[PDB]
Design a protein around this ligand. Sequence first.
Ligand code: HEM
Length: 94
Amino acid sequence: DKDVKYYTLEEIQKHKDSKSTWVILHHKVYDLTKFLEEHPGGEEVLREQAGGDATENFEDVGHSTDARELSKTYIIGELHPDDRSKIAKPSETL
Ligand code: HEM
């Protein structure tokens, strides 16, 4: 296609099992499937939610700017323009 990798909530929510753990973090989508162990913090903490707004979780901990750039290195594509009129996504806080 010509657009980026705009993926929908349902699709991303399917990328959280078997051995594909995605997370949506801000207005973009990140594959961390080969970052699980590599993540300086762990797999489990990262796979805890998966395929949902982990933004709240990521922002709770805040993260250093290193992570904000390294995040871009994991950028597969973006959150579909569908759920963009309402970025608001009430989910688990933890
Ligand atoms: C874009 C995806 C992410 C990247 C690239 C990333 C990167 C990093 C990096 C570089 C660190 C080391 C601390 C620092 O930033 O200076 C870190 C630590 C950590 N991250 Fe992430 N992270 C991501 C997503 C997440 C998410 C969604 C969670 C929560 C569900 C999480 C939980 C943690 C925790 C708990 C630590 C601290 C470990 C500890 O001190 O015990 N991270 N992350």
